[PDB]
């Protein structure tokens, strides 16, 4: 008989180079020598937050007592963006939990124990340097503008909801970073745009997608759900009506197969119903600490897209 | 036989008044009575950070159980900028470690012990109020523009590297604070501008000045050097190339005879070579605490100016 013990894996690959086609962090895993630097049995502490907004998802990691060779490989490439993947689970499988580029790295080795630090960004390089220069005339179909701008961003299309037969009412011009322009189109058309684990997600506010996840005491829930406001401020109201404005909170054992834009079903004894996801935070302490995930849910009032 | 014990001195002088010539904090030390208020044998905690950037270097200080007369002298002059100097060393000498103006001061005396607080700025008054209004035509030598703007700033010239026979390509106009205009000229010409302990330093990025300091176990080093990135973010690269982009970290016993723009030689058993300095932080606890200095080094790839 065994116990139920945690497991994880961390991989470091070649520098990421942006080209003239969508970037996939998967293909950069292999190093010039072939197999990548894998780190399994070392105490690790990490925190990974995810959201549906302009900003990329960022995660922090700490590793104790790394071998000198690995640290040397990171002393080099300090000018470059190494690709990194993280996996976690329970002794039988490990689900992808983050993938991005090493934004920052530093080492402090006071006496007894060295402590390496990381800051990782989910597509930070693309979202902050992809320039654009486009224009359109009166009568252009809005569905064409959306596709044109996304292709400029150079990322795979996770999911998109086209506008239909919508047409521009006035001439438009777009410059600067493509991400910023798209985030502005979100406000005026009730659409949510956010990149996550390399995938572009374009959806409509208020509406939600089946029960892709069910939460219950069998599903490793942790404590009862509690109602928490989804924003730190309140807006004036007429009392688009379809927009968000309500939510709840839940916690569960670590499970990387969840994304901010997904949908979940809450099977508890007090609260029951369907909710959207709005925010994720993954925490982990291998030898000591939690191994759980926190979800911020938001009520929905739109159509079932 | 003795031990190796710490010593320090703190001096407070007359209010600083800016005039029509370079400001020297040295000449304001003497008070109307003559000798200044010197504080030697009182527990003191201080933190002084220094850098090479637009912002002035600021340091914090705390003193316990001050006499009522001294506190009274600071209750007055609360509208004025008193000059302050700080010294530290080891029982045989004390090197100047900071000099500036008292930006802030507050007193809290709950029951047993009063605790005075200070915030000091290195040339804050000059850098934030020196206005300018200048213009030049096509063909003007850039070396003339630089000297004209610095004289406006009203500070002694610590060190400057002239541009040679460079000439303006387009007409230029400068207004507002002189410091801001100079900091903009830095970006477009690969030059570093930063005031420190009253001295103006204008140098060129990438290049460095002899071994003015050597670090080794004999030189009171504290722990091994570790590689740390010199910035909290990574820039996109073509992979001016001469710019910085790499660095290291070291710690040493308190030594005020060091400046951000200097050069140091690192004689350790793993790392060996020459580095620039980029950042300093001086910490101190007289009765209890550290008495060390931390240096952030940056690799160089330019000519040996």
């Amino acid at each position: 008989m065994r116990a139920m013990e945690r497991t994880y894996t961390l991989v470091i690959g070649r520098p990421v180079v942006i080209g003239e086609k969508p970037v996939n962090i998967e293909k950069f895993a292999n190093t010039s020598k072939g197999d990548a630097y894998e780190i399994k049995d070392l105490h690790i502490e990490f925190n990974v937050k995810k959201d549906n907004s302009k900003e990329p998802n960022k995660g922090y990691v700490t590793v104790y007592n790394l071998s000198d060779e690995v640290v040397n490989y990171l002393s080099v490439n300090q000018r470059e963006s190494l690709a990194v993947m993280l996996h976690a689970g329970y002794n039988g499988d490990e689900k992808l939990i983050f993938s991005g580029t090493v934004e920052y790295v530093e080492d402090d080795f006071p006496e007894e124990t060295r402590t390496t630090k990381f800051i990782l960004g989910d597509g930070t390089l693309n979202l902050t340097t992809a320039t654009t220069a486009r224009s359109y005339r009166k009568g252009t179909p809005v569905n064409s503008v959306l596709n044109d701008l996304i292709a400029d961003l150079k990322l795979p299309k996770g999911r998109v909801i086209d506008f239909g037969n919508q047409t521009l009412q006035t001439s438009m011009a777009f410059t600067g970073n493509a991400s910023q322009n798209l985030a502005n189109l979100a406000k005026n058309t009730g659409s949510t745009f956010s990149v996550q684990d390399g995938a572009v997600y374009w959806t409509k506010e208020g509406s939600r997608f089946n029960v892709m996840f069910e939460i219950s005491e069998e599903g490793g829930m942790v404590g009862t759900p509690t109602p928490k406001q989804p924003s730190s401020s309140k807006k004036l109201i007429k009392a688009h009506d379809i927009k968000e404005d309500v939510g709840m909170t839940v916690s569960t054992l670590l499970n990387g197969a969840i994304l901010p834009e997904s949908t979940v079903y809450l099977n508890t004894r007090y609260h029951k119903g369907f909710y959207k996801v709005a925010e994720l935070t993954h925490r982990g302490g291998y030898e000591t600490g939690d191994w759980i995930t926190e979800l911020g849910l938001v009520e929905t009032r739109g159509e079932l897209i | 036989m003795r031990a190796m014990e710490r010593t320090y001195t703190l001096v407070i002088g007359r209010p600083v008044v800016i005039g029509e010539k370079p400001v020297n904090i040295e000449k304001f030390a003497n008070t109307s009575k003559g000798d200044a208020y010197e504080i030697k044998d009182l527990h003191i905690e201080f933190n002084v950070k220094k850098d090479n950037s637009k912002e002035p270097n600021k340091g914090y200080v705390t003193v316990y159980n001050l006499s009522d007369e001294v506190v009274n002298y600071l209750s007055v002059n609360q509208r004025e900028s008193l000059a302050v100097m700080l010294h530290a060393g080891y029982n045989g000498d004390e090197k100047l470690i900071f000099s500036g103006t008292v930006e802030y001061v507050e007193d809290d005396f709950p029951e047993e012990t009063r605790t005075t607080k200070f915030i000091l700025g290195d040339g804050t008054l000059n850098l934030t109020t020196a206005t300018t209004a200048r213009s030049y035509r096509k063909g003007t030598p850039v070396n003339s523009v630089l000297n004209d703007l610095i004289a406006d700033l009203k500070l002694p010239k610590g060190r400057v590297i002239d541009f040679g026979n460079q000439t303006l390509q387009t007409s230029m106009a400068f207004t507002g604070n002189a410091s801001q205009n100079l900091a903009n000229l830095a970006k477009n010409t690969g030059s570093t501008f930063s005031v420190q302990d009253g001295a103006v330093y204008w140098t060129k990025e990438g290049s460095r000045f002899n071994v003015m300091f050597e670090i080794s176990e004999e030189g009171g080093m504290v722990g091994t050097p570790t590689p740390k990135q010199p910035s909290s973010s990574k820039k996109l690269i073509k992979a001016h190339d001469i710019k910085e982009d790499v660095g290291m970290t070291v710690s040493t016993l308190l030594n005020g005879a060091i400046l951000p723009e200097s050069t140091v030689y690192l004689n350790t058993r793993y790392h060996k070579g020459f580095y620039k300095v980029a950042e300093l932080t001086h910490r101190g606890g007289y009765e209890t605490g550290d008495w060390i200095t931390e240096l952030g080094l940056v690799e160089t790839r330019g000519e040996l100016i």
Binding site: E55, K58, Y60, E103, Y104, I119, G121, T124, L125, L127, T128, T129 | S231, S232, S233, K235, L236
Partner: peptide, 26 residues
Amino acid sequence: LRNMVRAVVDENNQFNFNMLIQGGPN
């Protein structure tokens, strides 16, 4: 003990600086 607190405050400041300054060609 203030040593422990200063470290956490420093790390939070570092995270905020990273959030403000990131990516970009300049």
